């Protein structure tokens, strides 16, 4: 259920967004709510490799954002950690992704998760 | 099955002089006989009257006025051409080619040659403007001959620099049915057959040609009847101002035997170079991936389509490649690399040809590089190997191939940008946690020596595996 | 009609092949007769 190992197999054959989501669950029996795994962070690492970020990783990130069970804080921290301003394509893609899910910032869960969201913000 | 019925009818009727008498009586007082003669022409016993009939039938299909003066010497006469075998001037030149077909049983090529001479005058002119129009044509081949002479004066190198990277292209001046053609490209794959020496005795189909000649056009244009080039720079060519000249309703066209897939930016830089619009009406723009695949699948005819489904397979002595062209890739401009097909080029003065042919050379080089992945080979669902490769364009004359690291697990991208006809630069993008694979100059040299993506991928794989 | 015009040509293209067939057996006739000569003299020789 390793992140790189599963992402490579997903990438080799063109898969729809829902099929990859269905498949990921099948790959690892204990999901652990995507916390130890840092799935949002892992996608970014694949995305920044190419000079132009591939649209399929961005679509996977969009789908992960769509589900309420993926916290917005982890995505924000992963985006902030990268920086390094190599080229305009990556910053434009990150700008579009950030523009997509902002202005709501709704968090459901325990209070310490809200505290972590404040620090991530 | 009609043979039995014919035999039965003949047996019925077999139960002459009377027929001859009836025909004689009719004689004393169309196309079917010509059709019978031309159908019997192919097997005619070799003799002088038989060849006379063959030539008269050939003229009948070609529409030439069939007039004979003797059994051995014949004259082809039409509006403005006159050729004798044993108008508006004498015979151009006693070229040995036409004698070569005539002396042997090569009359089909002779008929095509006659049709080509006729097609030289498919003009709507009034037999005086047409005359003048062909006179101008002479001026144009003189000007291109002077261009080639100047470029030969520039450097005493081989014809390879004349064809690939040079002004205009290699000359084959008009002689008989073969028009004056210009050689601008030969691919390294096409260059080597089964190492081909490139001495002066080069064939006309060895690669692709670019003919220049005149066809009537809907517009009226100012063209020089007299030769335009009289003074020559040491190494340049300068065109003297026109007007002699007069508003002649025709244009100079560069004809390509087959269409080339060209991007949109190539089209607008073409009107930037020339100024005359290429297309009368706006055509439908499509990504040039399907266009190039259909174009270079025609270099190997097959009546049965391959059903590739944009999943192309390549067979190598040690590797097997599975290719995904990945059409409709997201460019920064928001669209994809849209492209169309070009077959004809319009131009006004002989000073436009070098830039037009240079841009054509660049586009052909880029198209061949992209289409090297295109193959008819199928090695389906082979579990060992079967490396996955994805092609994604980035900008005009730019693209990139992204693929899994041959040893490691991260992705690796190799980006190609074509500078000139034989100039291509290469860059590498790799992850932070990775090892050395290759150098950009090595990839550029491999591209310049082969101009083929699968071969470059093989070289990179071998060099990374040796490390 | 035109179906018979080819039919003459179809018959035309075969007797010329058959014409040399008769000529080929002409040289053949000389070969067969000579062999008998020694057959008969041999028969007398053994008789």
Provide a descriptive summary of the structure in words.
The PDB classes it as transcription. This is part of a larger assembly, with chains A (121 residues), B (467 residues) and C (47 residues). Chain A is mainly α and 121 residues long. Chain A has seven helices and no strands. In chain A, helix 3 runs antiparallel to helix 4 and helix 5 packs parallel to helix 7. The longest helix of chain A is centred in the last third of the chain and has 14 residues. The radius of gyration of chain A is 14 Å and the shape is globular. Chain C is mainly α and 47 residues long. Helix content of chain C is 94%, strand content 0%. Chain C starts with a helix and ends with a helix. The chains are: A mainly alpha (121), B alpha+beta (467), C mainly alpha (47). Chains in contact: A-B, B-C. The interface between A and B is medium-sized, with 14 and 18 residues.
Beta strand count of chain B: 17
Radius of gyration of chain B: 29 Å
Shape of chain A: globular
Q: What characteristic shape of chain B results from the CA principal axes?
A: globular
Q: Proportion of β residues of chain A?
A: under 5%
Number of helices of chain B: 14
PDB class: transcription
Keywords: Transcription, Mediator.
Entry title: The IDRc bound human core Mediator complex
Chain A: Mediator of RNA polymerase II transcription subunit 24
Key terms:
part of a larger assembly; 3 chains; A: 121 residues; C: 47 residues; rod-shaped; Mediator of RNA polymerase II transcription subunit 24 (chain A)
SSE map:
The structure is cut from a larger assembly and holds chains A (121 residues), B (467 residues) and C (47 residues).
Chain A: H1 3-12, H2 17-27, H3 39-47, H4 55-66, H5 72-82, H6 88-101, H7 111-120
Chain B: H1 2-13, H2 17-28, H3 31-40, H4 48-62, E1 65-68, E2 74-77, E3 82-85, H5 96-103, H6 107-119, H7 129-154, H8 159-163, E4 170-172, E5 181-185, H9 188-191, E6 208-224, E7 232-233, E8 236-237, E9 245-263, H10 264-273, E10 286-287, H11 288-296, E11 311-315, E12 320-324, E13 338-347, H12 353-371, E14 387-393, E15 398-404, E16 411-418, E17 424-429, H13 440-450, H14 453-466
Parallel strand pairs in B: 12-14
Antiparallel strand pairs in B: 1-2, 2-3, 4-5, 5-6, 6-9, 7-8, 9-13, 10-13, 11-12, 14-15, 15-16, 16-17
Chain C: H1 3-46
PDB class: transcription
Keywords: Transcription, Mediator.
Entry title: The IDRc bound human core Mediator complex
